[PDB]
């Protein structure tokens, strides 16, 4: 086509989606990770995660307001990944890298799994 | 913080949100523009438009499944702007610029209004 493109549009959209999440506006699901609960937008979770994409395209699970993750999932690792979904920024540290990588593998977030593998390989 | 950032994350999220729109997945509103209907995600419309942000933060309108726009709004201009919201690409042409600018002013999409004003000024 002959379209023009606004370079900062995708980033501005994601910033506003994160502002809606922070104010709990139009959040339609709560993700339960052991004793912890995280409110989010199903569309953003699907757009970021192969696992959530599979869950919310399922004809019965698409209607659930609560999703319980596997008990082996670490709440902090999930929190870090949820923040990444809404911001593009990943808080990867020596103390959380193993939990973040395991959570990213479970959530099917291949670019996160990739950077965790590379950061671990460099420390070996 | 000491976060790392994935450059293509925001663009990848928006691409997936557009794929969900194309397959009518988790769309929660229909925008009526005279004889034409457009399905969308309320969160994306709010993230892109000052008008939709005001509508869907309203305690009664947040629950509506149908929103009717002002009869002066051109369906093609709306279609072009809805495509821009979900892609960052604006199909701006001599034949649609006036309708696109008027629709962007109504929807409160200031960056679109700005490029339309500049393109019009150059042709004068």
């Amino acid at each position: 086509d002959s379209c023009i493109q606004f370079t900062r549009h995708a980033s501005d959209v994601l910033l506003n989606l994160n502002r809606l999440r922070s104010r709990d506006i139009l959040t339609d699901v709560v993700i339960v990770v052991s004793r912890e609960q995280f409110r989010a937008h199903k569309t953003v979770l699907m757009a970021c995660s192969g696992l959530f994409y599979s869950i919310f395209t399922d004809q019965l699970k698409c209607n659930l307001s609560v999703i319980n993750l596997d008990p082996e999932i670490n709440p902090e690792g999930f929190c870090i990944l949820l923040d990444f979904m809404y911001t593009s920024r990943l808080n990867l540290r020596e103390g959380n890298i193993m939990a973040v990588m395991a959570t990213a593998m479970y959530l099917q977030m291949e670019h996160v799994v990739d950077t965790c593998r590379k950061f671990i390989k460099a420390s070996e | 913080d000491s976060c790392i950032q994935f450059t293509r994350h925001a663009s990848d999220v928006l691409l997936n949100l557009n794929r969900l729109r194309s397959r009518d997945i988790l769309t929660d509103v229909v925008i009526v523009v005279s004889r034409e209907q457009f399905r969308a995600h309320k969160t994306v419309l709010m993230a892109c438009s000052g008008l939709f942000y005001s509508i869907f933060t309203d305690q009664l309108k947040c629950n509506l499944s149908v929103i009717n726009l002002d009869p002066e709004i051109n369906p093609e201009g709306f279609c072009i702007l809805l495509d821009f919201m979900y892609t960052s690409r604006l199909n701006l042409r001599e034949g649609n610029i006036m309708a696109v600018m008027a629709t962007a002013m109504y929807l409160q999409m200031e960056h679109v209004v700005d490029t339309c004003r500049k393109f019009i000024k150059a042709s004068e």
Binding site: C3, I4, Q5, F6, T7 | R89, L90, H111, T115
Partner: peptide, 4 residues
């Protein structure tokens, strides 16, 4: 704005 750019030519993509």
């Amino acid at each position: 704005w750019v030519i993509p």
